[PDB]
Design a protein around this ligand. Structure first.
Ligand SMILES: *[C@@H]1O[C@H](CO)[C@@H](O)[C@H](O)[C@H]1NC(C)=O
Ligand SMILES: *[C@@H]1O[C@H](CO)[C@@H](O)[C@H](O)[C@H]1NC(C)=O
Lengths: 50, 365, 44, 388, 36
């Protein structure tokens, strides 16, 4: 996964809330590696699918 | 093999007696003895004496100056510039062994960077846990802290490792130690720094309140004891107090090394004049290796075993406890083992039993 | 550093653990907000 | 102002002319002109020359140069600072080399890179070669802990991960057999180390050793048994001339003195020409001499004795007792004319052909590529290799 | 030559069959080089 990390690192977010806000406005393709908050965003907000 | 070098008249007489004893039992040739009180002057004086002696044999002791920091440094640099191994008597300084800049600056007395094995053995015997170490900002303190950390790797604890340059107003280290709630601490620094640390601890009303620790041999002095409280388990050298005994062992070791090297046919001739020393000595590494391999079965300092870096593995230290402003030698640890039960150790708080290191720790963030 | 309210699953679990173990705790947040990493030998 | 002098142990007669031709528009007081010539390698001669220079005029800093390989003389020069509380400059030879852990209260300046700088240069070279060490082997030397610490710091800071992994040494070499080997030992120990490596087999065309300055200080009389392929890092072995270095040092000293005079309004002077003349006000000038700019280039340095823009060179030892002088380190930049170094050599022509070769960009962060790609020597319309 | 070949093939199992006088040198070289 080295080629999938260095080449796609400048688009990372420092906080989960910022990533959620960005993805709610269709400004982000997808967000992963956050199952702790993804098990709640897809349920309470019911606006995105996992 | 060359003329003896000593600071005082008594030291010169002791060196002459040691040379005579070595010659009585491969002959040592001496012509004159000289020394200087100024380090800058002594740097040229030692070179002139070595040139005039027409031999490579230098062995001096530490000056009686209170600082004892850079007075023998130019002499050590001059000795290590050539391939001339030297032996130091009653020179317990960790700065030389911290970087090993010199070629063969080896001292019979272990430097301040050593004796961490004694601390580890004492901690293992007393089952001490959750201890911290404070090291001075100097190179010797950093080397001692690194050695202690290396020897404590099975773990140890979260040591503060404060720099502590030696400022008059220093309370951050004491506050951190109080916050960490460590009963046993290990502090090693200069006499002034140790006195400042003891004064800060006394002002914090925590020196003798359920806190029992130990101190090294670097702070063992009359001035430090005048302000330090009781219940301190310091360390002292087995025979490093007097330099009149190590001279005989050094002379015997030098004679043994000379006898061993006499078999080799690659002995070089030192230059007659210091100026005419363009050639570089090439047999020095062999002589240093022979000296390191060679050892003395007994003597004034007992069995001597050079380590990898060239330090004698005597592993002997007397533990002195402080009580009623008096130092009592409760046994001594030899070979990094348990010390004899000459006297009962009394904690500064007033409890005969050793308090637990990890005590009074309930609140956590 | 205004004191905010900390509640939820993790807070309830921590409170239950402290009550079971009779421990005293002072929960606080992190100014940086990072989950922890090893940046340039020391964990930042 | 400054009674600096140049000692040559070689003529360097143009150093005085270059110093005189230097302007003093930004210099408050014109420096004194003094030159000391001596041919000796003894502390007594150096002490006598220093005393004579101090008696003649106020030195407040001297420049020492030598032709021998004895770097320990530079260490003695540091002690000279302890005897004078004045900066000491090096030009070439022993004074050029920088001692290990020589930082102290006394000020000393050297033109040679420190252990950390050498480790950084070696790491950059290995990154250019796209190889990894994956083997830790260090002999008992004074400059051992510092090198290991610098290597660990470099591999931790670097984004790309680094692999970590006479009978005893041979067994250790066999167990840690890696194409990249880092060693640091004296020449006497290196004589046996080379034989052990040849016996094991790492000295062949299967592994390369890196000895920047431990042994290969001057690879003009390299042993025949020394394996070919190893490289070393030097400090302007045949790039910067002695008169140029002397002129640069004089300019740096003058600029530092001007800065100290501006920031203190009192130029320090030696008390006398005695050994204990200054035994009785020295850190003020040292705190400003570190930030020194001269000849249109900042020469800022730390207490370790490094260079802001060192002129490091790389020498590649060959089988014919020859070393390549190609290599520059201007502005802390990595560049060389032998980046692609080794009927085992073949050339393969590769096109794009869409999904088969989709990588067409090279990362500009350090000039290297990923760990799962290859260099691609594209056409000039020279040898600018991209990632394939 | 023999030492390089022995070190290159660091297999846990090594087979050899030759005269004892010649095998002694090979065994000494293998021991010097160095589980198996
Ligand atoms: C410095 O000021 C006083 C003087 O000793 C002392 O009480 C105080 O704790 C010190 N504070 C710090 C931050 O060192
Ligand atoms: C050196 O000093 C100049 C001005 O005196 C300043 O502009 C520059 O930033 C300084 N450099 C360093 C490294 O302090």
């Amino acid at each position: 996964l080295s080629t999938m990390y260095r080449h796609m690192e400048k688009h990372n977010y420092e906080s989960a809330a910022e990533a959620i806000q960005a993805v709610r406005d269709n400004k982000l393709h997808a967000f992963i590696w956050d199952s702790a908050v993804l098990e709640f965003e897809a349920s309470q907000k019911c606006d995105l699918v996992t | 093999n060359i003329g003896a070098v000593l600071s005082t008249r008594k030291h010169e007489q002791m060196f002459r007696e040691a040379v005579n004893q070595a010659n009585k039992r491969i002959q040592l040739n001496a012509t004159s003895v000289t020394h200087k009180p100024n380090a800058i002057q002594m740097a040229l004086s030692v070179c002139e004496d070595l040139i005039s002696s027409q031999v490579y044999a230098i062995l001096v002791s530490h000056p009686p100056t209170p600082n004892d920091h850079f007075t023998p440094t130019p002499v050590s640099y001059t000795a290590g510039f050539y391939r001339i191994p030297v032996l130091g008597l009653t020179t317990r300084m960790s700065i030389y062994s911290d970087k090993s800049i010199h070629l063969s600056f080896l001292r019979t007395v272990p430097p301040y960077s050593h004796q961490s094995s004694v601390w580890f053995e004492m901690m293992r015997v007393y089952s001490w846990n959750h201890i911290i170490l404070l090291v001075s900002d100097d190179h010797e303190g950093r080397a001692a802290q690194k050695r202690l950390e290396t020897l404590l790797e099975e773990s140890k604890a979260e040591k503060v490792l404060q720099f502590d340059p030696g400022t008059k107003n220093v309370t951050a280290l004491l506050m951190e130690a109080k916050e960490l709630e460590a009963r046993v601490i290990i502090l090693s620094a200069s006499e002034d720094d140790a006195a400042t640390v003891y004064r800060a601890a006394a002002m914090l009303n925590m020196t003798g309140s359920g806190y029992v620790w130990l101190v090294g041999e670097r702070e063992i002095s009359g001035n430090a004891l005048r302000y330090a409280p009781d219940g301190i388990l310091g360390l002292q050298l087995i025979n490093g107090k007097n330099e009149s005994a190590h001279i005989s062992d050094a002379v015997g070791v030098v004679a043994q090394a000379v006898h061993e090297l006499l078999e080799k046919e690659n002995i070089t001739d030192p230059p007659r004049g210091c100026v005419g020393n363009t050639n570089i000595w090439k047999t020095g590494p062999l002589f240093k290796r022979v000296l390191m391999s060679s050892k003395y079965a007994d003597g004034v300092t007992g069995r001597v075993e050079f380590n990898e870096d060239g330090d004698r593995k005597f592993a002997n230290y007397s533990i002195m406890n402080l009580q009623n402003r008096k130092l009592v030698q409760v046994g001594i640890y030899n070979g990094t083992h348990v010390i004899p039960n000459d006297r009962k150790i009394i904690w500064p708080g007033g409890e005969t039993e050793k308090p637990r290191g990890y005590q009074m720790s309930t609140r956590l963030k | 550093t205004v004191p905010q309210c900390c509640y939820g699953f993790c807070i309830d679990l921590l409170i239950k653990l402290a009550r079971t173990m009779n421990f005293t705790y002072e929960v606080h947040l992190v100014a940086d907000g990072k989950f922890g990493t090893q940046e340039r030998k020391e964990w930042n | 102002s400054i009674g600096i002098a140049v000692i040559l142990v070689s003529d360097e007669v143009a150093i005085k002319d270059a110093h005189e031709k230097d302007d003093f528009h930004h210099l408050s007081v014109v420096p004194r002109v003094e030159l000391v010539a001596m041919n000796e390698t003894d502390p007594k001669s150096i002490i006598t020359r220093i005393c004579d220079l101090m008696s003649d005029r106020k030195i407040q800093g001297v420049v020492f140069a030598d032709d021998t390989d004895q770097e320990a003389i530079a260490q003695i020069l540091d002690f000279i600072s302890a005897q004078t509380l004045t900066p000491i400059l090096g030009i070439h030879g022993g004074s050029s080399m920088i001692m290990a852990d020589k930082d102290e209260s006394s000020m000393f300046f050297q033109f040679g890179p420190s252990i950390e700088q050498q480790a950084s240069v070696m790491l950059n070279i290995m990154e250019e070669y796209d190889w990894y060490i994956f083997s830790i082997v260090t002999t008992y030397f004074p400059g051992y802990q510092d090198f290991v610490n610098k290597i660990r710091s470099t591999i931790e800071n670097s984004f790309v991960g680094w692999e970590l992994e006479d009978s005893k040494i041979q067994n250790q070499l066999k167990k840690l057999q890696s194409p990249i080997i880092l060693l640091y030992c004296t020449k006497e120990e290196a004589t046996y180390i080379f034989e052990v490596a040849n016996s094991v087999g790492l000295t062949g065309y299967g592994y390369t050793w890196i000895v920047p300055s431990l042994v290969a200080g001057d690879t003009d009389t390299v042993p025949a048994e020394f394996p070919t392929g190893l490289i070393s890092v030097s400090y302007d072995e045949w790039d910067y001339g002695l008169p140029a270095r002397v002129r640069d040092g004089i300019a740096i000293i003058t600029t530092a003195a001007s800065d100290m005079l501006s920031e203190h309004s009192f130029i320090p002077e030696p008390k006398s020409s005695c050994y204990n003349t200054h035994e009785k006000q020295s850190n003020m000038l040292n705190r400003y001499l570190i930030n020194v700019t001269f000849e249109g280039r900042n020469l800022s340095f730390s207490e370790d004795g490094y260079q802001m823009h060192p002129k490091l060179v790389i020498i590649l030892l060959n089988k014919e007792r020859k070393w390549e002088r190609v290599g520059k380190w201007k502005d802390k930049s990595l560049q060389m004319k032998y980046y692609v170094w080794p009927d085992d050599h073949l050339s393969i022509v590769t096109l794009e052909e869409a999904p088969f070769v989709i990588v067409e960009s090279v990362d500009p962060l350090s000039g290297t590529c990923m760990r799962n790609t290859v260099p691609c020597q594209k056409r000039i319309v020279g040898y600018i290799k991209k990632c394939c």
